[PDB]
């Protein structure tokens, strides 16, 4: 599904945006945005790639690493670096069509623990993958089980009061119903734990 809608820009803010990807990098090609809040969901969309079309035809691959309070219907703020493949910077804004893609990237999935985190409070992102991510659940018994989690505003899939381990296994759900399977994930605080592949 397409849609159409103005981009402006700003400067951008991957590390302390609303998805919270505090030391994430963009892939190369791939620049930042931020999206309406209209359409914000609970971060559903966080971390998701988009193909946006120019007013001059040609198109960029961007994520959504922000949100945009101050936006309309469909709109997107543009990373600056990223408005200039489209058009000169001083323009402001322009139309754009745009669509969900898949990023294209090829390293794997990691995960971060909020700060903070332990036994007594499971909160969880999920870094660098390729699709969407539809949910994220917890195993504290081998995979015999999976919990489930919330995904917060600010894009970390939490349990209040925690499951009880300092270890567990975490299964990732792609919005097309992909899953990864993480073994011997820490949750300790601000820890982060690399999978062997993405979707």
Same mark, same amino acid.
Do not use: H, M
């Given at each position: 599904?397409?849609?159409?809608?103005?981009?402006?820009?700003?400067?951008?803010?991957?590390a302390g945006g609303?998805?919270?990807?505090? $030391?994430?990098?963009?892939?190369? $090609?791939?620049?930042?945005?931020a999206l309406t809040d209209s359409s914000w969901s609970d971060a559903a969309h966080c971390g998701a790639c988009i193909s946006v079309k120019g007013p001059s035809g040609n198109s960029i691959k961007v994520m959504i690493v922000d949100e945009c309070p101050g936006c309309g219907t469909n709109h997107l703020?543009?990373?600056? *670096? %990223?408005? %200039?493949q489209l058009a000169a910077t001083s323009v402001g804004v322009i139309n754009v069509d745009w669509?969900?893609?898949?990023?294209?990237? *090829?390293?794997?999935?990691?995960?971060?623990?909020? *700060?903070?985190?332990?036994?007594?409070?499971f909160s969880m992102q999920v870094v660098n993958a390729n699709e969407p991510v539809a949910s994220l659940e917890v195993s504290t018994d081998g995979g015999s089980t999976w919990?489930?989690?919330?995904?917060?505003?600010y894009n970390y899939f939490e349990k209040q009061s925690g499951f009880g381990t300092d270890t567990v296994d975490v299964r990732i759900t792609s919005t097309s119903g992909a899953t990864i399977t993480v073994k011997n994930v820490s949750c300790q605080s601000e820890?982060?734990?690399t999978a062997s592949s993405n979707f």
């Open positions: 599904s397409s849609y159409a809608g103005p981009a402006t820009w700003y400067e951008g803010n991957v609303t998805c919270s990807f505090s $030391g994430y990098t963009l892939a190369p $090609g791939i620049f930042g945005t703020d543009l990373f600056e *670096d %990223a408005f %200039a669509s969900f893609v898949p990023c294209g990237i *090829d390293t794997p999935i990691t995960l971060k623990n909020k *700060d903070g985190t332990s036994a007594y409070w919990q489930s989690t919330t995904r917060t505003y820890s982060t734990t």
